[PDB]
Coordinates of N, CA and C (backbone and C1' of nucleotides) in Angstrom, one line a residue:
Chain A
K1 N 36.8 16.6 -5.2 CA 35.7 16.3 -6.3 C 34.2 16.6 -5.8
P2 N 33.7 17.7 -5.9 CA 32.4 18.0 -5.5 C 31.4 17.0 -6.0
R3 N 30.4 16.5 -5.1 CA 29.3 15.7 -5.5 C 28.1 16.4 -5.0
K4 N 26.8 15.9 -5.5 CA 25.6 16.4 -4.9 C 25.4 15.8 -3.6
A5 N 24.6 16.5 -2.8 CA 24.2 16.0 -1.5 C 23.3 14.7 -1.7
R6 N 23.4 13.8 -0.8 CA 22.5 12.6 -0.9 C 21.0 13.0 -0.6
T7 N 20.2 12.9 -1.6 CA 18.8 13.1 -1.4 C 18.1 12.2 -0.3
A8 N 17.4 12.8 0.6 CA 16.7 12.0 1.7 C 15.2 12.0 1.2
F9 N 14.8 10.9 0.6 CA 13.4 10.8 0.0 C 12.4 10.8 1.3
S10 N 11.3 11.5 1.2 CA 10.2 11.4 2.2 C 9.7 10.0 2.1
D11 N 9.0 9.6 3.1 CA 8.2 8.3 3.2 C 7.2 8.3 2.0
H12 N 6.5 9.5 1.8 CA 5.5 9.7 0.6 C 6.2 9.4 -0.7
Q13 N 7.5 10.0 -1.0 CA 8.1 9.8 -2.2 C 8.5 8.4 -2.4
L14 N 9.0 7.6 -1.3 CA 9.5 6.3 -1.5 C 8.3 5.4 -1.7
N15 N 7.2 5.7 -1.1 CA 6.0 4.8 -1.2 C 5.6 5.0 -2.7
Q16 N 5.4 6.2 -3.3 CA 5.1 6.4 -4.7 C 6.0 5.8 -5.6
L17 N 7.4 5.8 -5.4 CA 8.3 5.4 -6.3 C 8.1 3.9 -6.3
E18 N 8.1 3.2 -5.1 CA 7.9 1.7 -5.0 C 6.5 1.3 -5.7
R19 N 5.5 2.1 -5.6 CA 4.3 1.8 -6.4 C 4.5 1.8 -7.8
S20 N 5.2 2.8 -8.3 CA 5.5 2.9 -9.7 C 6.4 1.7 -10.1
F21 N 7.2 1.2 -9.4 CA 8.1 0.1 -9.8 C 7.3 -1.2 -9.9
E22 N 6.4 -1.4 -8.8 CA 5.6 -2.6 -8.9 C 4.6 -2.5 -10.2
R23 N 4.3 -1.4 -10.7 CA 3.5 -1.3 -11.9 C 4.3 -1.5 -13.2
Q24 N 5.6 -1.0 -13.2 CA 6.4 -0.8 -14.4 C 7.8 -0.8 -14.1
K25 N 8.6 -1.8 -14.7 CA 10.1 -1.9 -14.4 C 10.9 -0.8 -15.0
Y26 N 10.4 -0.2 -16.2 CA 11.0 1.0 -16.8 C 9.9 2.0 -17.0
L27 N 10.3 3.3 -17.0 CA 9.5 4.4 -17.3 C 9.9 5.0 -18.7
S28 N 8.9 5.4 -19.5 CA 9.1 6.3 -20.7 C 9.6 7.6 -20.1
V29 N 10.2 8.4 -21.1 CA 10.6 9.7 -20.8 C 9.4 10.6 -20.2
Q30 N 8.3 10.4 -20.7 CA 7.0 11.2 -20.4 C 6.6 10.7 -19.0
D31 N 6.6 9.4 -18.7 CA 6.1 8.9 -17.4 C 7.1 9.3 -16.3
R32 N 8.4 9.3 -16.7 CA 9.5 9.7 -15.7 C 9.2 11.2 -15.3
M33 N 9.0 12.0 -16.4 CA 8.8 13.6 -16.2 C 7.6 13.8 -15.4
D34 N 6.5 13.0 -15.7 CA 5.2 13.1 -14.9 C 5.4 12.7 -13.4
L35 N 6.1 11.6 -13.2 CA 6.3 11.1 -11.7 C 7.1 12.1 -11.0
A36 N 8.2 12.6 -11.6 CA 9.1 13.6 -11.0 C 8.2 14.8 -10.7
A37 N 7.5 15.3 -11.6 CA 6.7 16.6 -11.3 C 5.7 16.3 -10.1
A38 N 5.1 15.1 -10.1 CA 4.1 14.7 -9.2 C 4.7 14.6 -7.7
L39 N 5.9 14.3 -7.7 CA 6.6 14.0 -6.3 C 7.5 15.1 -5.9
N40 N 7.6 16.2 -6.8 CA 8.5 17.3 -6.6 C 10.0 16.9 -6.5
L41 N 10.3 15.9 -7.4 CA 11.8 15.4 -7.5 C 12.2 15.9 -8.8
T42 N 13.5 15.9 -9.0 CA 14.1 16.1 -10.5 C 13.8 14.8 -11.3
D43 N 13.9 15.1 -12.6 CA 13.9 13.9 -13.5 C 15.1 13.0 -13.3
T44 N 16.3 13.6 -13.0 CA 17.5 12.8 -12.7 C 17.3 11.9 -11.4
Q45 N 16.7 12.5 -10.3 CA 16.5 11.8 -9.1 C 15.6 10.6 -9.3
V46 N 14.6 10.7 -10.2 CA 13.6 9.6 -10.4 C 14.3 8.6 -11.4
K47 N 15.1 9.0 -12.4 CA 15.9 8.2 -13.2 C 16.8 7.3 -12.5
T48 N 17.6 7.9 -11.5 CA 18.7 7.3 -10.7 C 17.9 6.3 -9.8
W49 N 16.8 6.7 -9.2 CA 16.1 5.9 -8.2 C 15.7 4.6 -8.9
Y50 N 15.1 4.7 -10.1 CA 14.7 3.6 -10.9 C 15.7 2.6 -11.2
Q51 N 17.0 3.3 -11.7 CA 18.1 2.5 -12.1 C 18.6 1.8 -10.9
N52 N 18.8 2.3 -9.8 CA 19.2 1.7 -8.5 C 18.1 0.6 -8.1
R53 N 16.9 0.8 -8.3 CA 15.8 -0.1 -7.8 C 15.9 -1.4 -8.8
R54 N 16.1 -1.2 -10.1 CA 16.3 -2.3 -11.0 C 17.6 -3.2 -10.5
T55 N 18.7 -2.5 -10.2 CA 19.9 -3.2 -9.6 C 19.5 -4.0 -8.5
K56 N 18.8 -3.5 -7.4 CA 18.3 -4.2 -6.2 C 17.4 -5.4 -6.7
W57 N 16.6 -5.2 -7.5 CA 15.6 -6.2 -8.0 C 16.4 -7.3 -8.7
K58 N 17.3 -7.1 -9.5 CA 18.3 -8.1 -10.2 C 19.0 -8.9 -9.0
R59 N 19.5 -8.3 -8.0 CA 20.3 -8.9 -6.9 C 19.3 -9.8 -6.2
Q60 N 18.1 -9.3 -5.8 CA 17.2 -10.1 -4.8 C 16.5 -11.3 -5.5
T61 N 16.5 -11.3 -6.9 CA 16.1 -12.4 -7.7 C 17.4 -13.4 -7.8
Chain B
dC1 O5' 30.9 -3.8 8.9 C5' 30.1 -4.6 9.8 C4' 28.7 -4.5 9.3 C3' 28.4 -4.9 7.8 O3' 27.2 -5.5 7.8 C1' 27.7 -2.6 8.2
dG2 P 26.8 -6.1 6.5 O5' 25.3 -5.3 6.2 C5' 24.3 -5.2 7.2 C4' 23.2 -4.4 6.8 C3' 22.8 -4.7 5.3 O3' 21.3 -4.6 5.3 C1' 23.6 -2.5 5.4
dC3 P 20.5 -5.0 4.0 O5' 20.2 -3.5 3.4 C5' 19.6 -2.6 4.3 C4' 19.5 -1.2 3.7 C3' 19.0 -1.2 2.2 O3' 17.9 -0.3 2.1 C1' 20.9 0.1 2.5
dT4 P 17.2 -0.1 0.8 O5' 17.9 1.1 0.0 C5' 18.0 2.4 0.7 C4' 18.8 3.4 0.0 C3' 18.6 3.4 -1.6 O3' 18.9 4.6 -2.0 C1' 20.8 2.9 -1.1
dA5 P 17.7 5.5 -2.7 O5' 18.5 6.8 -3.0 C5' 18.8 7.7 -1.9 C4' 19.9 8.5 -2.3 C3' 19.9 9.2 -3.8 O3' 20.4 10.5 -3.8 C1' 21.8 7.7 -3.5
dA6 P 20.6 11.3 -5.2 O5' 22.0 10.9 -5.6 C5' 23.1 11.6 -4.8 C4' 24.4 11.2 -5.5 C3' 24.5 11.7 -6.9 O3' 25.7 12.4 -6.9 C1' 25.2 9.4 -6.7
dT7 P 26.4 13.1 -8.3 O5' 27.4 12.0 -8.8 C5' 28.6 11.7 -8.0 C4' 29.5 10.9 -8.8 C3' 29.8 11.2 -10.2 O3' 31.2 11.1 -10.4 C1' 29.1 8.9 -10.1
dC8 P 31.8 11.8 -11.5 O5' 32.3 10.5 -12.5 C5' 33.2 9.5 -11.7 C4' 33.4 8.3 -12.6 C3' 33.6 8.6 -14.1 O3' 34.9 8.1 -14.5 C1' 32.0 6.9 -13.8
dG9 P 35.3 8.6 -16.1 O5' 35.0 7.3 -16.9 C5' 35.5 6.1 -16.4 C4' 35.1 4.8 -17.3 C3' 35.1 5.1 -18.8 O3' 35.5 3.9 -19.4 C1' 32.9 4.8 -18.2
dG10 P 35.8 3.7 -20.9 O5' 34.7 2.6 -21.3 C5' 34.7 1.4 -20.6 C4' 33.3 0.7 -20.9 C3' 33.1 0.4 -22.4 O3' 32.8 -0.8 -22.6 C1' 31.3 1.5 -21.5
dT11 P 32.6 -1.4 -24.1 O5' 31.0 -1.3 -24.3 C5' 30.2 -2.1 -23.3 C4' 28.7 -2.1 -23.7 C3' 28.3 -2.4 -25.1 O3' 27.4 -3.3 -25.2 C1' 27.3 -0.3 -24.3
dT12 P 27.1 -4.2 -26.6 O5' 25.8 -3.3 -27.2 C5' 24.6 -3.3 -26.4 C4' 23.7 -2.3 -27.0 C3' 23.8 -2.0 -28.5 O3' 23.1 -2.9 -29.4 C1' 23.4 -0.1 -27.1
Chain C
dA1 O5' 20.0 12.8 -25.1 C5' 18.7 12.5 -25.6 C4' 18.4 11.1 -24.9 C3' 18.5 11.1 -23.3 O3' 17.3 10.5 -23.1 C1' 20.0 9.5 -24.2
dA2 P 16.8 10.5 -21.4 O5' 17.2 9.0 -21.1 C5' 16.3 8.0 -21.9 C4' 16.8 6.7 -21.6 C3' 17.0 6.3 -20.2 O3' 16.3 5.1 -19.9 C1' 18.9 5.7 -21.3
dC3 P 16.0 4.5 -18.5 O5' 17.2 3.3 -18.5 C5' 17.1 2.4 -19.6 C4' 18.5 1.6 -19.6 C3' 19.0 0.8 -18.5 O3' 18.7 -0.6 -18.6 C1' 20.8 2.0 -19.5
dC4 P 18.9 -1.6 -17.4 O5' 20.5 -1.8 -17.3 C5' 21.0 -2.5 -18.5 C4' 22.6 -2.6 -18.2 C3' 22.9 -3.2 -16.9 O3' 23.7 -4.4 -17.1 C1' 24.2 -1.2 -17.1
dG5 P 23.8 -5.4 -15.9 O5' 25.3 -5.0 -15.3 C5' 26.4 -5.3 -16.1 C4' 27.6 -4.7 -15.4 C3' 27.8 -5.1 -13.9 O3' 29.2 -5.6 -13.9 C1' 27.7 -2.8 -14.0
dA6 P 29.9 -6.1 -12.6 O5' 30.6 -4.7 -12.1 C5' 31.6 -4.1 -13.0 C4' 32.2 -2.9 -12.3 C3' 32.6 -3.1 -10.9 O3' 34.0 -2.5 -10.8 C1' 31.1 -1.2 -11.0
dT7 P 34.7 -2.6 -9.3 O5' 34.3 -1.2 -8.7 C5' 34.7 0.0 -9.4 C4' 34.0 1.1 -8.8 C3' 34.3 1.4 -7.3 O3' 35.2 2.5 -7.3 C1' 32.2 2.0 -7.8
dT8 P 36.0 2.8 -5.9 O5' 35.0 3.9 -5.3 C5' 34.9 5.1 -6.1 C4' 34.0 6.1 -5.5 C3' 34.3 6.4 -4.1 O3' 34.1 7.8 -3.9 C1' 32.0 5.8 -4.3
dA9 P 34.7 8.5 -2.5 O5' 33.3 8.5 -1.7 C5' 32.3 9.4 -2.3 C4' 30.9 9.2 -1.5 C3' 31.2 9.3 0.0 O3' 30.2 10.2 0.6 C1' 30.1 7.4 -0.4
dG10 P 30.4 11.2 1.7 O5' 28.9 11.2 2.3 C5' 27.9 11.8 1.5 C4' 26.6 11.5 2.1 C3' 26.4 11.7 3.6 O3' 25.0 12.3 3.7 C1' 26.2 9.5 3.3
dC11 P 24.6 12.8 5.2 O5' 24.0 11.6 6.0 C5' 22.7 11.1 5.5 C4' 22.4 9.8 6.3 C3' 22.5 9.9 7.9 O3' 21.4 9.3 8.6 C1' 23.6 8.1 7.2
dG12 P 20.3 10.1 9.4 O5' 19.7 8.8 9.9 C5' 19.0 7.9 9.0 C4' 19.1 6.5 9.6 C3' 18.8 6.4 11.2 O3' 17.8 5.5 11.4 C1' 20.8 5.3 10.6

DNA sequence: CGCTAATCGGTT
DNA sequence: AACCGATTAGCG
């Protein structure tokens, strides 16, 4: 069952994703597309990163 | 083993 | 179409 390679986010990308999450728990389609483009990530990579980050936030609360 | 990226099926 | 919760799985 082929899967995608695990993305290794740069420190710059993780820093900017965490910054975005501190500002907004969810992104609009537009804001997700803008952040993806700004970080040279796919829309899916940013969507999944935000989904998993909300899961972690739920657990740590 | 812990952290977390990616995948699956169900919910809305 | 995006999310959620459960799950699978890569790597330090």
